[PDB]
Design a protein around this ligand. Structure first.
Ligand SMILES: C[C@@H]1O[C@@H](O)[C@@H](O)[C@H](O)[C@@H]1O
Ligand SMILES: C[C@@H]1O[C@@H](O)[C@@H](O)[C@H](O)[C@@H]1O
Lengths: 410, 409
């Protein structure tokens, strides 16, 4: 059993990040895979570079919004499958933002804005590339091109929080020369977090984080024992698409979003919440609504969201409650509460609501809700490690979806 | 019995916007705050002094309703807190003319609705926390209630209807409905009268009764040989009707679209509720849902207004249903997925036979409303079976409830 390296410990403390999809596809507003899935003429699609003005991209506003939502890092698409680069590739390619009307290195603006807000900037990079003929016609030269594009990101922007490698949809059993790619990154960015969405045996010793599906039930895989500890991360997009998709109406509820964030922490993973920017780089109004709601929850949950860790304490039969541990406190995360009415106005939260947990062995002095500081009544059986709390319902006018009670030990 | 013409017009409205706005909105902890949080009445009622309506724009509200595909708006003219959003002409000092706003907000509302061709409806609470008449002199309370409705009848031109909230009352009491409703008929013969305690109906003059969102089957239209009464369901976006800043428990936009579709399926109208801010703005969160709902209702316009339930059921294990207009049937199809390509599998790609029982006429063509794609189908006319291949959504889109129009031979 190994402990995480410092940089990975810092990663796990980040808790929540914002994922941002923005590319030429954003102009179409029919999903980021539009070029392949809608079988578009490549030449015609790539003309979208000519109208890429970034007229409404404001990295400062984006970093401010991330800070307000309680995110501690942002993963930006620096190049997606379409193969267009949002930064100055310094001669590697003409299909980049410096050859577009915007004439701005957007990654430079992004990194500066993240630093001002104390956020870690992370760079998403797609390894499956539809633009360069090298990908199909000269794979070894493709690897050189890929590696050079990452090298620019390693050398021109100062210290980088990390890299988010999307290795899906690739040729099977191809040699990707990961030792050389990740070795290069270690050389110029020793402190960078390397995230892989095909990191599972790990695909390379240098991988720091592996991605997992958001529905994963139990605590995630941290690597083979006595080997390097690897962290985990789940992702959620607000509708069915990652890039903006105007007529995708199938948005998840804000409630499900909050439950997914809580769930990530419960299984010992970070969570990225994704937004797709408009063609010109604005946060769309729908995404703002979700960020405002999530922000209210994460501000309330701040005592536990960053430092809280899974612990072997389970909830009683038939509840979805769980516990997170910090060094000073335990926190009960309680679901399926209702609002409290009054007298003959019954909203469902009114009755005594005993919620039990097994695995707490220390005597407790006080338990209180984070949102209003109400003190809860409880009983313990120290021998069996049972805690039962009366989990009162929400004050009329409020509903937190996931309610957190802080335990103060004697 | 078949609906009277004003009720038929009501059923064609399909979708309305419900708007909760009162003094409670300044608190942003739900519209029942005065009772449920056991406030001192005097202290709560000081909220009149800061009721500026500084951001209330009836034109913006009517425009938003038009854009979302709503055909009427129900505005709270007086809620349980008992404060009136219009000039009561001396009936009460607890009204907007005694607030800094100094505007008859109902007048602005009615003008804005007419401009956009929307019907204005007035919600009126009958359980009132402000006037001591309610408990101390019930007969005088009835007169006060009736007078407050009379002002709404006589001062604003023709009104689309009244939405009476009769919940939480004293159960035994004689409310003198024939007189109250009778007065409305005299002033506003064509007004729709909606009652949320309309159920035997509570009075012959009731036109519409309310029902729970979750009602599974087609709603109750009144006893045979009796006046037909329409139905209406309501949905609020979170758990509260007035604005509630720390209520994060919003329903998904998908559930909102499904609820709208469901209401039509059971032969009811649907109200989607928004709570305004203290100063009368539509909050940003509500704007998002309206824009998403608006995209769906624009696509569904051929069926959303005139479509009616019909005895055609869907096959085992699906939630699909059919709506009938005089020229077409429409298949409303749920649980579809997005179509990928080649090795990119999103779940909607395979042939997806969806069947219906009760279609007896030969069909010429079936096509999706969103993109005009023609669907393949087979029929067994003797058993009245229709089976369509319900293709999945084009990548980049997802309508939640997809609608196919049937064109008959
Ligand atoms: C993060 C998401 O997952 C990757 O596999 C991509 O294929 C998607 O377009 C999106 O970037
Ligand atoms: C639509 C709802 O109707 C009544 O039941 C009121 O008690 C609520 O506050 C709300 O106005």
């Amino acid at each position: 059993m190994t402990e995480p390296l410092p940089r990975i410990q810092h990663y796990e403390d980040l808790g929540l990040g914002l994922f941002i999809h923005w590319g030429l596809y954003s102009q179409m507003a029919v999903g980021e895979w539009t070029e392949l899935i809608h079988h578009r003429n490549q030449h015609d699609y790539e003309q979208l570079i000519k109208t890429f003005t970034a007229a409404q991209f404001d990295a400062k506003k984006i970093a401010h919004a991330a800070k307000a939502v309680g995110a501690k890092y942002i993963v930006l698409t620096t190049k997606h499958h379409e193969g267009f680069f949002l930064y100055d590739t310094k001669g590697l390619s003409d299909f980049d933002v410096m050859h577009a009307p915007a004439r701005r290195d957007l990654i430079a603006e992004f990194v500066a804005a993240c630093r001002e807000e104390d956020l870690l900037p992370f760079f998403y990079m797609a390894t499956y590339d539809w633009h360069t003929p090298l990908y199909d016609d000269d794979f070894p030269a493709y690897l050189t091109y890929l590696q050079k594009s990452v090298e620019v990101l390693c050398r021109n922007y100062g210290p980088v929080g990390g890299f988010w490698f999307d290795g899906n949809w690739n040729k099977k059993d191809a040699d990707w020369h990961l030792p050389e790619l990740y070795g290069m990154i270690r050389h110029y960015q020793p402190n960078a977090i390397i995230v892989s969405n095909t990191g599972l045996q790990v695909s390379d010793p240098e991988i720091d984080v592996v991605t997992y599906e958001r529905r994963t039930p139990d605590e995630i895989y941290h690597g083979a024992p006595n080997e390097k500890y690897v962290a985990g991360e789940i992702s959620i997009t607000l509708n069915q698409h990652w890039g903006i998709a105007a007529n995708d109406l199938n948005y998840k509820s804000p409630a499900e979003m909050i439950e997914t964030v809580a769930h990530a922490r419960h299984i010992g993973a970070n969570i990225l919440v994704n937004i797709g920017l408009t063609g010109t780089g604005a946060i769309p109004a729908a995404a703002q609504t979700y960020m405002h709601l999530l922000g209210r929850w994460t501000a309330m949950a701040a005592p536990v969201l960053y430092k809280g860790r899974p612990v072997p304490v389970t909830s009683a039969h038939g509840t979805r409650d769980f516990v997170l541990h910090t060094s000073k406190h335990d926190f009960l995360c309680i679901l399926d509460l209702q609002v409290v009415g009054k007298d003959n106005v019954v909203l469902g939260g009114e009755g005594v609501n005993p919620r039990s947990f097994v695995g707490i062995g220390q005597p407790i002095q006080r338990i209180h809700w984070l949102d209003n500081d109400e003190v809860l009544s409880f009983t313990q059986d120290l021998d069996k490690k049972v805690l039962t709390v009366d989990a009162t319902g929400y004050p009329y006018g409020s509903d937190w979806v996931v309610r957190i009670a802080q335990i103060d030990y004697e």
